[PDB]
Amino acid sequence: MPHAFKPGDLVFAKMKGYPHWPARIDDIADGAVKPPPNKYPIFFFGTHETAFLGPKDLFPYDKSKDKYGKPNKRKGFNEGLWEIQNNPHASYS
């Protein structure tokens, strides 16, 4: 059975106006800005940007990749697909 989301988990993350996007739940570094309650720090592969999202917008990658893991014309998406398949736990700073 599923657990709650934790840092390191791989997802497609949905924001308004954007296709479901390869991403991971990030850690919060010592001294870093924490998310709001009930929100997770989402790092978006390819763009390397961070937003705060709740579970309603988070699709676990293994279940969802057949549907959402296809090339897309948007800036950074295909790079993002490479990253989540090939080195999803690397430093992209």
Curated annotation (Swiss-Prot):
Ranges for domain PWWP: 7-64
Cell compartments where the protein resides: Nucleus; Cytoplasm
Effect on the protein upon substituting residue 21 to A: Loss of interaction with histone H3K36me2
Origin superkingdom: Eukaryota
Tissue: Widely expressed. High expression is found in heart, skeletal muscle, ovary and testis. Overexpression is frequently observed in hepatocellular carcinoma samples.
Known partners and oligomeric status: Interacts with HDGF. Interacts with trimethylated 'Lys-36' of histone H3 (H3K36me3). Interacts with trimethylated 'Lys-79' of histone H3 (H3K79me3), but has higher affinity for H3K36me3. Interacts with IWS1. Interacts with H2AX, POGZ, RBBP8 and CBX1. Interacts with histones H3K9me3, H3K27me3 and H3K36me2. Interacts with DPF3a (isoform 2 of DPF3/BAF45C). Interacts with SMARCA4/BRG1/BAF190A, SMARCC1/BAF155 and SMARCD1/BAF60A in a DPF3a-dependent manner.
Family from the record: Belongs to the HDGF family.
Name of the protein this chain belongs to: Hepatoma-derived growth factor-related protein 2
Gene name, Swiss-Prot/TrEMBL: HDGFL2
